[PDB]
Paper text:
The mitogen-activated protein kinases (MAPKs) are central components of the signal-transduction pathways, which mediate the cellular response to a variety of extracellular stimuli, ranging from growth factors to environmental stresses. The MAPKs are activated by [name] kinases that phosphorylate the MAPKs at conserved threonine and tyrosine residues within their activation loop. Downregulation of [name] activity can be achieved through direct dephosphorylation of the phospho-threonine and/or tyrosine residues by various serine/threonine phosphatases, tyrosine phosphatases and dual-specificity phosphatases (DUSPs) termed MKPs. [name], the biggest molecule in the MKP family, selectively inactivates [name] and p38 following stress activation.
To understand the molecular basis of [name] recognition by [name], we determined the crystal structure of unphosphorylated [name] in complex with the [name]-CD. In the complex, [name] has its characteristic bilobal structure comprising an N-terminal lobe rich in β-sheet and a C-terminal lobe that is mostly α-helical. The overall folding of [name]-CD is typical of DUSPs, with a central twisted five-stranded β-sheet surrounded by six α-helices. [name]-CD is positioned onto the [name] molecule so that the active site of the phosphatase faces towards the activation segment. We also observed the binding of a chloride ion in the active site of [name]-CD. Thus this chloride ion is a mimic for the phosphate group of the substrate, as revealed by a comparison with the structure of PTP1B in complex with phosphotyrosine. In the complex, [name]-CD and [name] form extensive protein–protein interactions involving the C-terminal helices of [name]-CD and C-lobe of [name]. The aromatic ring of Phe285 on [name] α5-helix is nestled in a hydrophobic pocket on [name], formed by side chains of Ile197, Leu198, Ile231, Trp234, Val256, Tyr259, Val260 and the aliphatic portion of His230. The carboxylate of Asp268 in [name] forms a salt bridge with side chain of Arg263 in [name], and Lys275 of [name] forms a hydrogen bond and a salt bridge with Thr228 and Asp229 of [name], respectively. In the [name]–[name] complex, a hydrophobic motif (285FNFL288) that initiates the helix α5 in the [name] catalytic domain directly binds to the FXF-motif-binding site on [name], providing the structural insight into the classic FXF-type docking interaction.
Numbering used by the authors:
A (entry chain E): 7 to 32, 38 to 174, 187 to 330, 353 to 362
B (entry chain G): 158 to 298
The structure:
């Protein structure tokens, strides 16, 4: 398809296929109407993604991953193009995806029952399981890169890090430890917690501060865990005041949950239990995504009866 | 632009050094570059500059370049010069060297010196590898 036009969106120029109509802003991403599919879509511009060695490797991975992965809780790729005609001309990539109605930041902020929180978390966990099954650990799961539809369907937008908002990263990442799949479970816990509490669990402007909120709430890790850290990280961490932390009953009381819910005392204890197994500093004692999906709080949703030449190269497929 | 930490000592990122204008306004005479990749600004005499060739990682050792680093800052204040300590972002590597410098000259501990720099440049967040090393440096002093 070679039919291109241009529109000024805010400070940028989008130059897209004629099929994408009436662009409105929401990378820089605008919304459009796809005349050939008769639905709204999102168009994300990647400008000079090879502006350097880094943008290249992140863009190429995302671009490859987006093309070969597909699952219901991962945002769907509809199209990929470049308005430029040559490899020399080559400047910008456009990614067309399906368009949701809101990001998880907004949704967190709404008034949610147990049924909806459970469903969002369940979807999150399936998205992640699918990623791990493909050998992809996300390591950067945040409410801002998760979007949800009006009817509560949840899609994960990105594939995470290779290989500023730091609030959802696992202790392993701050502590320089090795990580495994259940790293992503820590992020889920943070999100879950945020949904119940009504605000970020561990809000901080740097590593020190992050760690602090973490230990102030969950308690200083035991000596066995301290010994797992490399010498230097260990000397810094063992030098920080000790904290007893709080039990999950005190961190997540009943009152925080929506008030007139059928069976909420049981539902709140299920939620607290799940949290208590997710917000666990020692990753070797933290639950897995598979165990999480089987947890009483989440398992209601299981149904037994159902189922730069490179970049440019990759854009022209 | 870059953050004044002390009189004659600035802490910044590579976009700061590469900006001729900003650099001319502050008086940036010297450069302590704390990265392997960030190049010297076309306008700084070699002798007025220093690379501390380190990466921002958990395995990098920035402790053995400390002494060198503080001297270079001290030396440049002796000639009555103004030093910019930077790395790619001025968040981790360069902030670590600035803090070491604060610890030494103000007889401050890591906690105190970190807070001193942090109040002036709130985006600083050196990794725990570097902070552990700074505790080790606290001892030497
Ligand atoms: Cl940095």
């Amino acid at each position: 398809d070679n039919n291109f036009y241009s529109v000024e969106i805010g400070d940028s120029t989008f130059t897209v296929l004629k099929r994408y109509q009436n662009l409105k802003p929401i990378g820089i991403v605008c919304a459009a109407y796809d005349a050939i599919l008769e639905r709204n879509v999102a168009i994300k511009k990647l400008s000079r993604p090879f502006q350097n060695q880094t943008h290249a490797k992140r863009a190429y991975r995302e671009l490859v991953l987006m093309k070969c992965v597909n699952h219901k809780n991962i945002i769907g790729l509809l199209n990929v193009f470049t308005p430029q005609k040559s490899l020399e001309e080559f400047q910008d990539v456009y990614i067309v995806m399906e368009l949701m109605d809101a990001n998880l930041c907004q949704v967190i902020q709404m008034e949610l029952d147990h049924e909806r929180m459970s469903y969002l978390l369940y979807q999150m966990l399936c998205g992640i399981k699918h990623l791990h099954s493909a050998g992809i650990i996300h390591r950067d799961l945040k409410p801002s890169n998760i979007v949800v539809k009006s009817d509560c369907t949840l899609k994960i937008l990105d594939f995470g890090l290779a290989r500023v908002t730091r609030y959802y990263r696992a202790p392993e990442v701050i502590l320089g430890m090795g990580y495994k799949e259940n790293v992503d479970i820590w992020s889920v816990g943070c999100i879950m917690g945020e949904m119940i509490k009504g605000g970020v669990l561990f809000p901080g402007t740097d590593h020190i501060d992050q760690w602090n909120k973490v230990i102030e709430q969950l308690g200083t890790p035991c000596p066995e865990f301290m010994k797992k850290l490399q010498p230097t990280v260990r000397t810094y961490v063992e030098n920080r005041p000790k904290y007893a932390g709080y039990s999950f009953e005190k961190l997540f009381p009943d009152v925080l949950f929506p008030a007139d819910s059928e069976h909420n005392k049981l539902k709140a204890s299920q939620a607290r239990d799940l949290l208590s197994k997710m917000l666990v500093i020692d990753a070797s004692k933290r639950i897995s995504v598979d165990e999480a999906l089987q947890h009483p709080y989440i398992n209601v949703w299981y149904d037994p009866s159902e189922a730069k030449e490179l970049i440019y190269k990759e854009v022209m497929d | 632009g870059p953050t004044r930490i002390l009189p004659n000592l600035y802490l910044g990122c590579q976009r700061d050094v590469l900006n001729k204008e900003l650099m001319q306004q502050n008086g940036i005479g010297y450069v302590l570059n704390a990265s392997n990749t960030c190049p010297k600004p076309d306008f700084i005499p070699e002798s007025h500059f220093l690379r501390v060739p380190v990466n921002d990682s958990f395995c990098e050792k920035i402790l053995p370049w400390l002494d060198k680093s503080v001297d270079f800052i001290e030396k440049a204040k002796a000639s009555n010069g103004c030093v910019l300590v930077h790395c790619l972002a001025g968040i981790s590597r360069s902030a670590t060297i600035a803090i070491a410098y604060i610890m030494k000259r103000m007889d401050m501990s890591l906690d105190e010196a970190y807070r001193f720099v942090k109040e002036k440049r709130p985006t600083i967040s050196p990794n725990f590898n570097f902070l552990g090393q700074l505790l080790d440096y606290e001892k030497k002093i």
